[PDB]
């Protein structure tokens, strides 16, 4: 399949882009696995770091 | 060291213009790197991983110095007195 | 910090001392000195009422500003000095109007640093503020019990307390002893921990050094006679030989509590040590 | 790192012969070229080409297979090595496979075969056995 970030060409992920992060976050707030979301590993790392930043800044929930 | 400082050092010690691979240039840059890592370790004593790379650099500089001393004694003496590495 | 002597003699063997690297001036401020003759544990009747005090080196008293009531004016730490009258060191500070005072030297206070006191002071080591204005969680020392009386709590070397919470008229504090108690929020405290943290580690090493400190020898109860002590007498060595160990004056002295009842502070003391 | 180019060349030849390759390209040197020429003259290989390019040049050997696809080169063995060098006299020159094989030798009169060494009555460093 194809990766959202690879297709859209975006080469950076901003932790304040809560709407985008909600795409890859689960219903309960867990980070969806790469094999499910289709994302590449390179951008999966960026996504995890951005999601944890947002959790710290309370933009996104933990649980 | 910063690439700017490295450029300054290579300009200072290059045998001729465009020379980046001379033993003098390599060992001067290695001296700068060794001093920087020593200054880092003085604060971060327990950084064994960094110190290992420091020792690799020291050995590389030692082998370059051995080669230079074997090839041209006068150049070796001049370089070591310039760098204060004896 | 701690210097370990070589065993050149059996007296020096295992002895240690402070290196005094923190001290930056080895003589005191003349105008802040007062005489301190020794009592040797003898009261106004001339009788020994506390044992084991006497002799020891002559000492001058350094007047110390425990009150820290000179507010809104900066003071610069001129020096850190030795003080024979207490475990902590003392910092001579010089106020911007030219008045000089000694304070307890906090851990980390450096020569040339600035300190201030008052409700508006910043929360940094050596500044003095009402507990009203000190945040929760801050480590403090030289804590007042009555506003304006001067610090009485957490003044020894390494001492500190922690602000825990703020009730209406009182602030909760955890003292070095582990006691948690209330203190009037108008009472002042100094930010930080008292310096000279290695004080307690010193191995005094020999009897003479205690004598220099003015401590006379402690004779154990069990090696006196019955008329001297409840533990006295018995042929040869003897065990305590009664239900509880006793003080020289005939009171039980192992586990027996002595804090008096019906004290005003009992409703301020939230948790004992 | 590399320590015996002659051993490397012999092992290249052996590996190519085992896999039944037709040609074999290796970095060149004068001793290697002389060895290859001796092999060709004796009939163990088919052809030898020298490519006079940069980087010391290249040798391109062409291996020889008989009828029934039988391998002409049965085996190559390094004799003298950097770790232990072997020399022999003219009267002590060894015969490989009772004479059915060659011993490549290095002599004051150039690197030759054991037959030529015995004929000229000279000895030298026994580089290799080929059979």
């Amino acid at each position: 399949k194809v990766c959202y970030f690879t297709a859209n060409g975006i080469t950076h992920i901003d932790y304040k882009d809560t709407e985008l992060l909600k795409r890859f976050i689960s219903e309960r707030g867990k980070i969806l696995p790469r094999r499910v979301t289709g994302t590449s590993a390179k951008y999966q790392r960026m996504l995890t770091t951005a999601i944890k930043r947002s959790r710290h800044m309370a933009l996104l929930p933990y649980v | 060291i910063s690439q700017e400082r490295k450029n300054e050092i290579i300009k200072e010690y290059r045998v001729h213009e465009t020379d980046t691979g001379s033993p003098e240039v390599q060992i001067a840059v290695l001296t700068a790197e060794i001093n920087a890592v020593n200054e880092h370790l003085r604060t971060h004593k327990k950084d064994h991983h960094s110190r290992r790379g420091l020792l690799k650099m020291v050995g590389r500089r030692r082998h370059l110095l051995n080669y230079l001393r074997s090839k041209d004694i006068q150049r070796y003496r001049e370089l070591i007195k310039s760098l204060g590495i004896r | 910090a701690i210097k370990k002597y070589k065993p050149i003699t059996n007296g020096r063997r295992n002895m240690t001392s402070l290196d005094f690297a923190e001290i930056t001036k080895t003589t005191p401020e003349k105008s802040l000195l007062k005489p301190l003759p020794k009592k040797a544990g003898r009261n106004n009747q001339g009788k020994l009422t506390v044992r084991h005090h006497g002799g020891g080196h002559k000492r001058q008293y350094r007047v110390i500003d425990f009150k820290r009531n000179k507010d809104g004016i900066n003071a610069k730490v001129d020096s850190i000095q030795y003080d024979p009258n207490r475990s902590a060191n003392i910092a001579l500070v010089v106020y911007a109007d030219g008045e000089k005072r000694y304070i307890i030297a906090p851990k980390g206070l450096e020569v040339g640093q600035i300190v201030e006191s008052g409700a508006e002071a910043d929360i940094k080591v050596g500044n003095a503020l009402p507990l009203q204005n000190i945040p929760v969680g801050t480590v403090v020392h030289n804590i007042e019990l009555k506003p304006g009386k001067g610090g009485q709590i957490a003044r020894s070397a390494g001492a500190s307390a922690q602000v825990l919470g703020k009730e209406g008229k009182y602030v909760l504090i955890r003292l070095r002893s582990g006691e948690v108690r209330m203190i009037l929020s108008t009472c002042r405290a100094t930010i930080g921990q008292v310096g000279n943290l290695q004080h307690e580690l010193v191995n005094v090493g020999k009897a003479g050094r205690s004598r220099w400190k003015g401590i006379r020898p402690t004779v154990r109860g069990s090696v006196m006679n019955p008329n001297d002590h409840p533990h006295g007498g018995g042929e040869g060595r003897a065990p305590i030989g009664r239900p509880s160990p006793m003080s020289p004056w005939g009171k039980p002295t192992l586990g027996k509590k002595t804090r008096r009842g019906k004290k005003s502070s009992d409703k301020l003391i939230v948790r004992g040590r | 790192t590399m320590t015996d180019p002659i051993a490397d060349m012999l092992t290249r030849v052996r590996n190519a012969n085992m896999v039944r390759h037709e040609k074999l390209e290796l970095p060149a040197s004068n001793i290697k070229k002389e060895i290859a020429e001796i092999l060709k003259s004796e009939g163990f290989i088919k052809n030898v080409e020298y490519v006079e390019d940069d980087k010391q040049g290249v040798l391109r050997l062409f291996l020889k297979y008989g009828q029934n696809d039988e391998r002409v080169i049965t085996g190559l063995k390094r004799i003298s090595k950097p770790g232990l060098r072997v020399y022999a006299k003219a009267s002590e020159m060894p015969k490989v496979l009772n004479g059915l094989g060659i011993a490549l030798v290095s002599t004051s009169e150039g690197v030759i075969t054991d037959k030529e060494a015995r004929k000229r009555n000279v000895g030298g460093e026994i580089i290799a056995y080929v059979w």
């Binding site: 304040k16 930043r53 309370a58 929930p61 | - | - | -």
Partner: protein
């Protein structure tokens, strides 16, 4: 070296008090040879979880560029001391 500093001010803050607080902390981030490239406010936003029992927070974003991090360190120290800022974070880039 650039830095993005995000902080949250308690929801129950008077307008003038919040204005003074934001001005003070922007000045702090500007002091130590650090140039405030741009400061903005994202308004009061719902928090994903209660912080100090607050369900809302005034979000302030600041971008400042400096050759060191003294201004950022002073900001963080004064934000820890402060009882008006609930959360803060500094990101290099």
């Amino acid at each position: 070296r650039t830095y993005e500093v995000m902080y949250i001010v308690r929801p129950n803050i008077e307008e003038d008090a919040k204005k003074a607080l934001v001005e003070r902390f922007n000045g702090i981030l500007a002091t130590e040879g650090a140039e405030v490239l741009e400061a903005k406010d994202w308004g009061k936003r719902r928090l994903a979880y209660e912080i100090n029992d607050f369900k809302d927070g005034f979000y302030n974003i600041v971008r400042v560029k400096s050759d060191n991090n003294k201004a950022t360190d002073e900001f963080q120290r004064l934000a820890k001391i402060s009882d008006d800022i609930i959360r803060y974070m500094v990101i290099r880039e």
